[PDB]
Amino acid sequence: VYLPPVPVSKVVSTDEYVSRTSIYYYAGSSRLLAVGNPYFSIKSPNNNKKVLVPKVSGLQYRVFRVRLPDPNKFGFPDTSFYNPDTQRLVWACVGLEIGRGQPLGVGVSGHPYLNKFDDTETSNRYPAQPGSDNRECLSMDYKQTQLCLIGCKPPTGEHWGKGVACNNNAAATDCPPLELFNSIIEDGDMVDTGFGCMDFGTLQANKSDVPIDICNSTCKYPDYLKMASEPYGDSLFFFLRREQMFVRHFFNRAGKLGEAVPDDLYIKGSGNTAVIQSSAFFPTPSGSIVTSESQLFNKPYWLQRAQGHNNGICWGNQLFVTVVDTTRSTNMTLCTEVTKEGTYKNDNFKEYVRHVEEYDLQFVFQLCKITLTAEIMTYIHTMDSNILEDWQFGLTPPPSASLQDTYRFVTSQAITCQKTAPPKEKEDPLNKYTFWEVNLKEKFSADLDQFPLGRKFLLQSGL
């Protein structure tokens, strides 16, 4: 004999209470400017905290965090469609357009002291070559990728890294155990390029296994599965991805191979074949052709059904657009002279390398009202508390009282000290991180056909 185990209060789809109107609005940013060094930041020598020239390349994530003006602070000419005593107003997204205007062409990087031992494609004879230091200069193309994310919560990532060891055991080899983590994706941090989603800063002592841009960083990677499985669904509205790579060359490492390959698999040789070379091999991704029809931008994106339960409604008046491109990541060179003379010499010039990058944000929104009633206000309150606060209509006693007295003291800390805990709301949890911010509080409009999107929006909507 058994039983239906436990009734649990479920989450519900957001189209149950959110009501839509026939009022639309436009927003649009200006052209964004970004320029810097493709390899590393330029730090000031005297004070080593302020930057001189920042590091930016193609393979850094460009997370965007726009701001939205609160719709309740709008004096409308005809306030008859809603009551501000019983309702409130909040925005929802319906459109998306990301523009890039740089010409195509992939960027490249490298590393001057890369741990190449020998080429392992057609000829590696015996015996071993002499030397204690055999690092070489190599330059290397990257794999290509295209993606896009939108949502109300900033996107949550995941990466490998050094974690906890185990108990003192003499049977487990000196190998750092690998552990999964969950992180919030910052700006500037990198994407995988076929070398695993692990931190290279705390796992590679030699710093000679990747190109120079990704030795001391965490090449994070976006999670789909954990993010799709969030019950509230306020992180992923709508997303695409497209990537490709293939092998170009083959290489081996160099050094004391940490595990001897077992004798059960091979017959050992002699003469010139007494010693054994390495087994630590690694490829190089290069990337392939990039068409104009393999692009995922300069295209409208109409949304009518998100995969999560949030149907585009954005609490807190903020969005989160993250984009990764490599197709316009080309690298220009600069050549300035020191002296002018009529004969070429290799020390009269100086070289700097740079990289440019620009973006375009283009949006259309819809106005939505919430008829706040007693059975509904409890439903948001178990989801969040900040949205109920900044609407400025009420406050909450968090219990209905406690059940234990808990024995509060009164004589102020002179006999048996405890955790005093001076509190602070800290006004957001997101303030520790750093995003490319772009304001839009003076960039709304109601007349559509003076902008490219609303001209296209009127055709697909049939209005």
């Epitope: 108990n167 003499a170 080899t173």
Partner: antibody, heavy 120, light 114 residues
Framework: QVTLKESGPGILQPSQTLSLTCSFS??????????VGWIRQPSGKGLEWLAH???????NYHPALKSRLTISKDTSSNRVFLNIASVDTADTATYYC????????????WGQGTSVTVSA | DIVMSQSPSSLAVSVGEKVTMSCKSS????????????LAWYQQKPGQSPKLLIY???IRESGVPDRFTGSGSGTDFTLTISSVKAEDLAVYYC?????????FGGGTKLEIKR
């Protein structure tokens, strides 16, 4: 095939260093499959495990002591050496060095059983 | 540690008799995935060092005859000998190699009855 003998100082004083040397012939310790321990016994009491060191250079010790007991091998001469510092009156015993398996997970064939008695 | 306790300290057996020698522990020697009992046994002949008998509580060492057999599972264990002879006069020891650190038992002394 496997032959085994130990060698130690024999007579020690309190608060001195103990260098018990173990010697083997018949195998190599860097081979994947060979492994050795170190076991003591007094004349009257039973037996107890002290230290055991494996192929890939990691060490375990008896956690009651955990400080003085430092085991180390020399795979080039194919030997193990036992290094106890500050030998006290409780270490009056007869040590036994031998080779272990892990398909049997026990100590196969043992040696001479060198005697270390410490007094004034 | 996980302690080891053996009983009795000595047992007098005649020639041709079967001896049951019992050793116990405080924690069960079975693993949930390994499914082999983490136990082995020893034989300290007078004037000789201890030698190996049977491993994983049911699998014998090469050279030990069929008269020596190990049993027991969980926490109770007994070494079962079919018919004892002249050569088996010794001191036997219990060994658990399950949890680190490893320890020995109290031990038992076998004598031929006179």
């Amino acid at each position: 095939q496997v032959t085994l003998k130990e060698s130690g100082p024999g007579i020690l004083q309190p608060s001195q260093t103990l260098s018990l040397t173990c010697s083997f012939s018949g195998f190599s310790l860097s081979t994947s499959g060979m492994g050795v321990g170190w076991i003591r016994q007094p004349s009257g009491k039973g037996l107890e495990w002290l230290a055991h060191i494996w192929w890939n250079d990691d060490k375990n010790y008896h956690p009651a002591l955990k400080s003085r007991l430092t085991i180390s091998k020399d795979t080039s001469s194919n030997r193990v050496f036992l290094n106890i510092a500050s030998v006290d009156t409780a270490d009056t015993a007869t040590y036994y060095c031998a080779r272990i398996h892990y398909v049997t997970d026990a100590l196969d064939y043992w040696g001479q059983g060198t005697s270390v008695t410490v007094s004034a | 540690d996980i302690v080891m306790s053996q009983s009795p300290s000595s047992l007098a057996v005649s020639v041709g008799e079967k001896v049951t020698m019992s050793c116990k522990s405080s924690q069960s020697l079975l693993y949930s995935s390994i499914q082999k009992n983490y136990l082995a046994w020893y034989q300290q002949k007078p004037g000789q060092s201890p030698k190996l008998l049977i491993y994983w509580a049911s699998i014998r060492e090469s050279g030990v005859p069929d008269r020596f057999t190990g049993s027991g599972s969980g926490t109770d264990f007994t070494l079962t000998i079919s018919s004892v002879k002249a050569e088996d006069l010794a001191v036997y020891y219990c060994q658990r190699y399950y949890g680190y650190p490893w320890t020995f038992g109290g031990g038992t002394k076998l004598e031929i009855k006179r």
